[model samples]
Target: DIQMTQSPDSLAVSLGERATINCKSSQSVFSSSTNKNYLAWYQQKPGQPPKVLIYWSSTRESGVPDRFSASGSGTDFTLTISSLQAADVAVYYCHQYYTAPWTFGQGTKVEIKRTVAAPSVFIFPPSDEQLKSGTASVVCLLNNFYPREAKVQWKVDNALQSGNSQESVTEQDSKDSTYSLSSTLTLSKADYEKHKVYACEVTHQGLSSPVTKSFNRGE
Candidate 1:
């Protein structure tokens, strides 16, 4: 028997927003028999029996939306929704349909997608670590955002940093119902002073270029 683990203790999202759910079986669900995995994914509606979204690891059910995808197999697995919609409202579960006494994952609730206005970005002042460790830390904070997706670009003087940098997950605000996201960049004080310019460019669907806020380092 296996147990599927899901996260986002506060599950929710909007259009163009992505959600990831992980499932790790207590033991290997992989069966050497027929060279196949004993894994499957199912979705259930309010009054409907479980609808198989994916089986055989990555096979999709008939007419299933492209946004829903399944990956991983055997003892561990992943189910990701590239985006959410109102019609997507339902409970999702994972289990081994081939094994006896099939196991199942707790139902995960998916919300619909919507939009507000746009995201407002702000960069906090450089840290004093600049003097202590010769490292300059820059924080780009985005507030009152929608869809919970924000892209940040890091630059030292004239060159762009091309890779996945350190970033935090999007946080939902209960008071205003907006979102808050942030990304951090660390550099040597030598470069900070040499380049003399550390800038953060945020990209939102609403703001293609020239982000809502662009903050640079001090002189």
Candidate 2:
């Protein structure tokens, strides 16, 4: 199982200002066999559900705007928003659809705080038992997100690890211009309990804060 962490519980974006988020996986989702990456990005507006943004690192879902693009390979990827708009104000999140028990980053709120000069933020996972076999992976679920561009990372007790992998990004409507992203991590049952804490991190550009969460294993 993989854990995701995000930064900046919330953020303020000015009209036309660029915002960013970072997400890390608990383990590596890189697949050498297929030569493909598993990761996705999404967005969530107030009082609304999440929408797909980008998938497979660079593949934009049908109808996605040219301004929104995903770049990178393997463990490192970037979600870029060429221009920000008033309608872009919302929570942004990343997920891992490659593996089961699909996971999401915490989330970062994008709003018109003040003058909007490159709002940056981050998300992180909880520091608890994140990967337990029979316990029914519960803390590993993401409900909603905004912004649309964020990264996902996987770590064990603050250190990086690698194993099974998956991730993707999808777009909802070309007319409305909505998008989403996700990433997944897989590990051997024996290595699941090796660490006391598993987590994910999200980083955005310009903003001063980042969000994070850690999960604990059940006894």
Candidate 3:
């Protein structure tokens, strides 16, 4: 089965503005024999079954609005809302049915731009169990944010560190429509002990400046 992942796990677009969600599959979802993309897109509404919006990657399902569109072939695909609307607030998912065990991408939440919600950022140092290992694990969490697009980084003693090995993920709260993003960084135990301070910095549109939280080794 092909693995699917979506970009910008969540999005917020102003009413009447355009919104786009991109999905990438680990393998081609297109079938050369039939010359058709064996992919589909869906709109998942609360308290209702997911509705198919596009089939064969580009064909709009009957009754779907014209403002919503999709296009792509093989491994890359996109779903676009020409003009976002309040009623269009929902989660969108991409799926591939080319083979057994069909796969779906992580859903993308569409939110109407409005009053921004500033995320409360929190950072945690390596746990006792983790401290016993050769490396230490650190985690940073940004909760209940809004308007999308959040960048997270790690710093040591106020010096910017290359966080290339860190992993990040974003999830949307179904009930309140808020977003939560978390990042994890792994470092050698020696590095953790050598640094007097470790900080997690978050930049979001909701905040005027980057928010930083620190972890003290001597604490």
Evaluated with lDDT, which candidate comes out highest?
A: 3
Measured by TM-score, the strongest candidate is 3
> lDDT by residue for model 1 over 1-219, one digit each (tens)?
556665542366766778777777777777687767777788877678988888887888889898889888677788888877556656788887666778787767665545664777777657665557777777888777766667788776758776535887543444455667778877667766666556678887767665734445563
What TM-score, over all chains together, does every model reach? 0.52, 0.49, 0.58
User: What value of lDDT does candidate 1 attain over all alpha carbons?
Assistant: 0.71
Cα deviation at 4, candidate 3, in Å, is 17
In candidate 1 the C-alpha lDDT for residue 7 amounts to 52
Error of 1 at 76 (Å): 20
lDDT (0-100) at residue 71 of candidate 2? 68
- Candidate 1: list runs displaced more than 4 Å: 1-91, 97-109
lDDT for predicted candidate 3 compared with the true structure: 0.85
TM-score: the better of candidates 2 and 3: 3
Worst 10 residues of 3 by lDDT: 163-172
Overall lDDT per candidate, in order of appearance: 0.71, 0.60, 0.85
Question: What does candidate 2's lDDT look like per residue over 27-83, in tens digits?
Answer: 666688887778888988756888888888678889877777876666565666667
Report the C-alpha displacement of residue 90, candidate 2, in angstroms. Answer: 0.8
